[PDB]
């Protein structure tokens, strides 16, 4: 009902643990409630896999006071989840009231219904997960291997999962000769091979398309064949498109399939295999 | 009467607490099945807006202060929007129309992870690659993916067996259609007897009109056949109908004999 004796007595073992000595006009409510005030900056885990600062996040209080006891670099892979119901002093918010001796939760309810000296909440409970991306720029920096500092394993595994593919499709169209783009192409997934087929339909003359053709053949020759057809249908004057698209007359298939072994320029010439279709490349060896 | 007042230390948010779901459309979309994606604090007034934006995801309340996350529960990518492409793994749908980039008010729908390796696209692309909807690139690449379908689940190999049978029947009816010409091209690329013999079978089950227009090397006239005996070289290295016939409609015999020239 009415308070007339309040004191803070020291604690044992832990500097954070103190005792709020409460004495009211009615000795009915009169206890030395043990309360803790977190003063650590956690660089380690309290229990295996989680961090529980001695802080009672009151209802309505911002959730940044729980994370104000962790090293910032350390608190990046940790997420805040719901905690156990606790009570804090309203005049000293964030304190963690311990239920010990005669400090029963029933006494906490009595204090609430009799005075506004207390407020309920939940215990700060962080658990480790992994680095958390939050925008397209973070995914761009992680997948492109340009800033793999704060990057979870799903976006930082040398393109061994189907996570970075969406970004890499558009990213490698601006840089096809990128070593990381060629590594993502060696994963031999459908989006990468079709993206590089779109790339080599316009820029077959480059050398990264030579590497693309050596990567896809003989397992996924179709993308390279379609890209070669498109490129030699757009660039018909190239001396390199002479076997895949015969420029003279209207018979551009003059050296397709077995007929690729007729013109010596399509077999033993200083021209990369990217300029021949897959059937042409196979017939070149068996003949 | 005098209370020992003491305000809490200044709060310092974490990376989780500074997340905004309105910026993570390139982070939630590539999430796999049953993978939690923390989206930071979320107000109740914006709950439905998220739920209507990502219907494949369940919104879970991970922590206090609105700390929520999205857990993938579905792949609602329809077959026409997922099978007729080889690199568009997701899309957005606003009103009735579908875009590949995000737009305000649109709804996310993601395709199956490896959808060209499960057989889910065989039924849709079998009908799509017939008629005016045939694609010179997508359908050829789909027939090529059928030969390299790394699916050893009984359902997948059964589906590709059914597709192989339907292809054999359809191309025995009429091999001049583009999808069947691509099928014969891929069979030639397979370079095994099991494929060469099916090529020869499909080509031999064709009408006389098909052979008198496309297979004039494999089926020569009486005069050309009579005159070919006057030369020691194979007729394929001599008949202009062989030098000009497309490779996709050649029998394995003539396809091999053309390699003997020069």
């Amino acid at each position, epitope marked *: 009902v009415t308070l007339n004796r309040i004191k803070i007595a020291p604690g044992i073992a832990d500097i954070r643990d103190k005792y709020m000595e409460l004495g009211f006009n009615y000795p009915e409510y009169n206890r030395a409630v043990k309360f803790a005030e977190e003063s650590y900056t956690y660089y380690y885990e309290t229990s295996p896999g989680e961090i529980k600062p001695k802080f009672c996040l009151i209802d309505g209080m911002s959730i940044d006071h729980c994370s104000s006891f962790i090293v910032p670099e350390f608190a990046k892979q940790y997420v805040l989840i719901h905690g156990e119901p606790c009570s804090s002093f309203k005049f000293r918010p964030g304190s963690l009231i311990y239920y010990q001796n005669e400090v029963t939760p029933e006494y906490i309810k009595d204090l609430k219904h009799a005075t506004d000296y207390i407020a309920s909440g939940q215990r700060c409970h962080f658990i480790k997960k992994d680095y958390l991306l939050g925008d397209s720029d973070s995914v761009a920096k992680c997948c492109s291997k340009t800033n793999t500092k704060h990057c979870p394993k799903i976006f930082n595994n040398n393109y061994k999962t189907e996570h970075c593919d969406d970004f890499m499709t558009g990213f490698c169209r601006n840089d096809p000769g990128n070593p990381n783009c060629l590594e993502w192409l060696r994963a031999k997934r459908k989006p990468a091979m079709s993206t590089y087929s779109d790339i080599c339909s316009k820029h077959m003359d480059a050398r990264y398309c030579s590497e693309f053709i050596r990567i896809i053949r003989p397992d996924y020759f179709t993308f390279g*064949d*379609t890209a070669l*057809y498109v490129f030699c*249908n757009d660039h018909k004057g190239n001396r390199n498109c002479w076997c895949a*698209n015969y420029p003279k*007359s*209207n*018979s*551009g*298939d003059k050296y*397709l399939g077995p007929r690729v072994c007729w013109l010596h320029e399509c077999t033993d010439e200083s021209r990369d295999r990217k300029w021949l*279709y897959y059937n042409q490349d196979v017939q070149r060896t068996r003949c | 009467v005098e209370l020992p007042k003491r305000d809490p230390p200044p709060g310092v948010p974490t990376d989780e607490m500074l997340l905004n779901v309105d910026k993570m459309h390139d982070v939630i979309a590539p999430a796999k099945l049953l993978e939690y994606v923390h989206i930071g604090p979320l107000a109740k007034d914006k709950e439905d807006k998220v739920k209507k934006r990502y219907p494949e995801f369940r919104l879970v309340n991970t922590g206090p202060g609105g700390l929520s996350a999205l857990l993938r529960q579905s792949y609602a990518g329809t077959a026409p929007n997922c099978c007729r492409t080889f690199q568009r793994t997701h899309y957005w749908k606003k009103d009735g129309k579908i875009s590949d980039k995000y737009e305000e008010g649109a709804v996310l729908e993601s395709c199956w992870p490896d959808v060209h390796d499960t057989g889910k696209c065989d039924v849709d692309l079998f009908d799509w690659c017939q008629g005016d909807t*045939f694609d*010179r690139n997508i359908c*050829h690449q789909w027939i090529g993916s059928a030969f390299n379908r790394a699916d050893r689940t009984v359902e997948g190999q059964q589906s590709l067996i059914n597709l192989y049978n339907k292809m054999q029947t359809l191309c025995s009816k009429d091999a*001049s259609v*583009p999808i069947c*010409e*691509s099928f014969l*091209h891929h069979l030639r690329a397979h370079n095994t007897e099991d494929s060469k013999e099916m090529i020869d079978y499909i080509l031999r089950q064709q009408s006389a009109d098909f052979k*008198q*227009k*496309y297979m*004039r*090397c494999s089926y020569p*006239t009486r005069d050309k056949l009579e005159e070919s005996l006057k030369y020691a070289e194979p007729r394929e290295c001599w*008949d*202009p*109908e*062989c*030098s*000009n*016939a*497309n*490779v*996709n409609f050649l029998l394995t015999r003539n396809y091999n004999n053309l390699g003997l020239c020069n």
Partner: nanobody
Framework: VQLAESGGGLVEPGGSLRLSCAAS????????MGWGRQAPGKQRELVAT???????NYVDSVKGRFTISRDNAKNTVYLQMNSLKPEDTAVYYC??????????????WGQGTQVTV
């Protein structure tokens, strides 16, 4: 792919005409080249064809009168129609069976020129 046709008109029975078709556009190769006519109320029918190797095939109702040929230069296809008869009244179209890709083909037709006898 476009097929420009010419040579059609009106002539009395027993005359002669020459139809000519020029194939323009990006064409990879050709399977066969043919001529097709369509009488009013009937279906379009292919009356004469020539393959890429120079092998010709005609319909019995035409054999003896018409001759299909091709000039490699300009890549044009001609139909020399001789000894015409009033039964030849039709819209003659130009048929071009091209090979769009090394793995597919296309059957492109023309607008059609009227020939009445």
């Amino acid at each position: 792919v476009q097929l420009a046709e010419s040579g059609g008109g009106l002539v009395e029975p027993g005359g002669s005409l020459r139809l000519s078709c020029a194939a323009s556009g990006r064409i990879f190769s050709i399977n066969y080249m043919g001529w097709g006519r369509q009488a009013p109320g009937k279906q379009r029918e292919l009356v004469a064809t020539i393959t890429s190797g120079g092998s010709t095939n005609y319909v019995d109702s035409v054999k003896g009168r018409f001759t299909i040929s091709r000039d490699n230069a300009k890549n044009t296809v001609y139909l020399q129609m001789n000894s015409l008869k009033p039964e030849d009244t039709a819209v003659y179209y130009c048929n071009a069976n091209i090979r769009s890709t090394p793995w597919s083909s296309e059957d492109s037709w023309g607008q059609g020129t009227q020939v009445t006898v």
